[PDB]
């Protein structure tokens, strides 16, 4: 409704099937209040593949 | 509710002393700053013992540096040094910093930095 | 005082009263042009006499006739 399930996705992740040790597209998931904050949420979070804290944006 | 500066600083010292705790391997470095004098102590809380204490009331800094009214940054640095050497000679390297109620800044800050350049770990 | 947020406090404020009086005070302006200030105001004596003396109907009767 006004409170929604949102997927965060690593921006610097390449879906092409990368050549490194572990290949995959990091997604986290969480909830947002779509009314309170209409701005697409951006969050710095850990990515198991890139191995560093990356920036995870959103998907529509 | 104590608006006496005295009682207030005692409040902050207790609040800080919640978190930081003297142990055999990591003694507490305790700063007291009064108007005419800078006093510093080092404590192992478990044994309830002070291992080393340096102050402006000791003849070393008395004959070294004199000051007019309040303790200077210079005074502080001289003390941080003195206690660094004093403790490094009893085998105490790694310790925890008790800012004793005062904002970390000014001669407190300088006290710290002086103790750091001289081989004390915190 | 914090800088730039406050209106400027000019420490020198000359108080010029139209009796050609010049004293010093403090305020945002440099000069203050005054009429009726503390000294040179009715309050102390003249106002006491006006409020407290204004009655007396009997003598008011006798001044007319006598």
């Amino acid at each position: 409704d006004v409170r929604v399930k949102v997927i965060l996705e690593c921006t610097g992740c390449v879906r092409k099937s990368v050549n490194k040790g572990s290949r995959g597209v990091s997604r986290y998931i969480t909830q947002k209040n779509r009314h309170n904050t209409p701005s697409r949420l951006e969050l710095r979070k850990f990515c198991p593949y890139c191995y560093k804290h990356t920036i995870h944006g959103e998907i529509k | 509710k104590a608006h006496t500066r005295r009682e207030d600083r005692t409040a902050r010292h207790v609040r800080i002393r919640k978190k930081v705790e003297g142990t055999p391997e990591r003694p507490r470095l305790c700063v007291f700053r009064s108007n005419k004098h800078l006093y510093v102590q080092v404590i192992d809380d478990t044994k309830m013992h002070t291992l080393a204490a340096a102050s402006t009331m000791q003849k070393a800094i008395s004959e070294n540096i004199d000051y007019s009214a309040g303790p200077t940054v210079e005074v502080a640095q001289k003390i941080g040094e003195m206690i660094a050497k004093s403790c490094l000679e009893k085998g105490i390297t790694k310790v925890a910093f008790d800012r004793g109620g005062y904002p970390y800044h000014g001669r407190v800050k300088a006290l710290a930095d002086a103790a750091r350049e001289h081989g004390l770990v915190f | 005082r914090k800088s730039d947020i406050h209106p400027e406090f000019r420490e020198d404020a000359k108080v010029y009263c139209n009796g050609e009086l010049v004293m010093t005070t403090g305020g945002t302006q440099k000069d203050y042009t005054v009429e009726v200030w503390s000294g040179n105001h009715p309050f102390y004596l003249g106002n006491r006499s006006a409020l407290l003396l204004d009655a007396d109907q009997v003598e008011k009767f006798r001044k007319k006739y006598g």
């Binding site: - | - | 005082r1 947020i5 406050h6 209106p7 400027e8 406090f9 420490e11 404020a13 108080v15 009086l21 010049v22 004293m23 010093t24 005070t25 403090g26 305020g27 945002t28 302006q29 203050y32 042009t33 005054v34 009726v36 200030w37 503390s38 000294g39 040179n40 105001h41 309050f43 102390y44 004596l45 106002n47 006491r48 409020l51």
Partner: protein, 193 residues
């Protein structure tokens, strides 16, 4: 009919000297003697003067707030603080965090200076004036007086003023009784009763 403002108008004078130096020079010996204190520090001192504008209809229109802020500023040489209402109040149409009044606190030398521009400047230039009530003390030695309109001060330019806005002034003193506080004020030139 007794005049202690023949002390305030006495000769051509300076600011700092007026308030602070007449305090140290004249006031302190006088009080020390007449109340017979056994140490100097028991002398009544002026601690702080908070000036407080109470306007709650100004929360509705912010420009009145800015205007009155600027007024209180030009008067006191200090850019005011805008006080927020703590609780939601029904009959006054107030919710939390809504900006109600306007408050400044004057300390140190600005305290004495504004106190001076009070007694010796605006108070006599007021609307019809008898004397400030001797009965406005709080019993612990701190005094308060209302000002119905702010055209009193010349820093306030009366043709440029949109509407009359009231002020409250609260003088805070180390004095523990009203006698000592009253003598302190009057000796400093205050027009009582």
């Amino acid at each position: 009919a007794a005049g202690t403002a023949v002390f305030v108008d006495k000769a051509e004078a300076e600011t700092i000297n007026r308030l602070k130096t007449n305090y140290i020079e004249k006031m302190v010996p006088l009080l020390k003697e007449e109340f017979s204190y056994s140490n100097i520090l028991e002398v009544p001192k002026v601690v702080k003067i908070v000036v407080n504008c109470g306007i709650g209809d100004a929360s509705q229109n912010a420009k009145g707030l800015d205007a009155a802020i600027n007024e209180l500023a030009l008067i006191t040489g200090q850019r005011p603080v805008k006080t927020k209402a703590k609780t939601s109040i029904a009959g006054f149409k107030v919710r939390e965090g809504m900006t109600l009044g306007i408050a400044v606190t004057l300390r140190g030398n600005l305290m004495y200076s504004f106190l001076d521009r009070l007694i010796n400047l605006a108070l006599p230039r007021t609307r019809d004036f008898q004397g400030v009530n001797p009965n406005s003390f709080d019993g612990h030695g701190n005094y308060s007086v209302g000002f119905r309109e702010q055209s009193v001060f010349p820093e306030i330019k009366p043709e440029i003023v949109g509407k009359a806005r009231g002020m409250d002034v609260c003088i805070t003193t180390t004095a523990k009784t009203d006698k000592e506080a009253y003598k302190l004020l009057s000796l400093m030139g205050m027009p009582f009763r």
